[PDB]
Amino acid sequence: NDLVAKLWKLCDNLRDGGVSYQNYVNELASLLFLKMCKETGQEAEYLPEGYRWDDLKSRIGQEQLQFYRKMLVHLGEDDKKLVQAVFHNVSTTITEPKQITALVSNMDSLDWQYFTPRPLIKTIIHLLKPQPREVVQDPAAGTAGFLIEADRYVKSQTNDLDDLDGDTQDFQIHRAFIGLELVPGTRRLALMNCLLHDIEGNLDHGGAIRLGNTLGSDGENLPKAHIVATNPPFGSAAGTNITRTFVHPTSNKQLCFMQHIIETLHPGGRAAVVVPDNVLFEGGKGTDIRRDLMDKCHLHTILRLPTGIFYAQGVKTNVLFFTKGTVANPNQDKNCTDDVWVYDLRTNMPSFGKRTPFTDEHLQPFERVYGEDPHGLSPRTEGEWSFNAEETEVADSEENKNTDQHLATSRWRKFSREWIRTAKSDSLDISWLKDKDPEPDVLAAEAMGELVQALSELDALMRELGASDEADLQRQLLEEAFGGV
């Protein structure tokens, strides 16, 4: 039915990927199984480390097809005969690298928004403190919200540019701010926004916001920047093909933006990037890119945002604050990150909505402890108990290990690089507070039952698709009977 039709659409990738109608189900079953094991929440018990859904899903292109082949072989040969019995003599018939990438991501988002809270924008620009002569970039301009605010901040510190010499004024008007938007419709609105804000940008490109793909040619043709404040798209984003090579090729749109942001920043540059929880915990290439970030950049602060502050809803978001290299050594290539400060402004927070609005008041505590230095070098000391932090349930995890009662309830805590490396296995999904009081492995299990049911039926349509010119004209003979009404 609905599930079978949904599985069918995916076979379109297999069809155009080199796969025959006879192996559709086989191809799908494999991927679905790996995907389900993850959804179960205990893939650690079924699949071997290094060969799980994230390891395949995060990769892209040929690098992905070859990994898939290597993974099919590794699974079909081992003593863990349990899983082995499912991948024994199993091999994919996919040849088109663009097709597998399209398939894995397609079902990854299978089932069983350019809005940013104003107070968040204000806060982000306030902590970045953009100065004149600094080029502020926005890879995902949208309606130019961050740029307009960055410009507003600069004007509020220079009497609307009047404290600066004409030449610097021209810089602020034509070169200080740059954006890039994929959707022409949105870019138009963004263009009108800057224009009425006296932000002319470069006439060669239409103005401050350029039209194009950050993950494409336009992305690398973009000029470097001193500052980057952006809220890239969530999910698998819109029609944005990753036709650009990165230090670590990925199928994760968000992790691609991160790689771009790390690249355009001048040495000593600084950025604030709004990201989803996935970016912090995703494995596979996700771990490589996160290690790359903490190598090439000095990630110093992580703000875990509440829920329901975005027009979306069930999206967990954060804000990473970091510097390209280090203030002392703007060109450092490695070990830039040492101590990472995290501020939990999510767990045990007032359910935000039109009733409970998210205001600047909710961000003042965090901005206080943060410091006045835009590079997060102002003196800091763990200890912040706002929004009833003391009445929040403390979680029992590595984060709170050997931690005293008072600190384990603080919304402001620091973690070392070695700790993140060891305990967290290089994951930035750091949390040490439990929120107040179905089931994954249970939902996944029942779900799998149905997929299996669907998969069988779907196979029949093939197994029983008696190849001949009979079904060709017999099927259209029914169409020869009109349709509808």
UniProtKB/Swiss-Prot annotation:
Biological process annotations from GO: DNA restriction-modification system; methylation
Keyword Nucleus: no
Enzyme class of the recorded protein, top EC level: transferase
SUPFAM superfamilies assigned: S-adenosyl-L-methionine-dependent methyltransferases
Subunit structure, interactors included: The type I restriction/modification system is composed of three polypeptides R, M and S. The restriction enzyme has stoichiometry R(2)M(2)S(1). The methyltransferase is composed of M(2)S(1). (Microbial infection) Interacts with Escherichia phage T7 protein Ocr; this interaction leads to the inhibition of the methyltransferase restriction enzyme M.EcoKI composed of M(2)S(1).
Annotated family: Belongs to the N(4)/N(6)-methyltransferase family.
Protein name: Type I restriction enzyme EcoKI methylase subunit
Source organism of this protein record: Escherichia coli (strain K12)
Gene (name only): hsdM
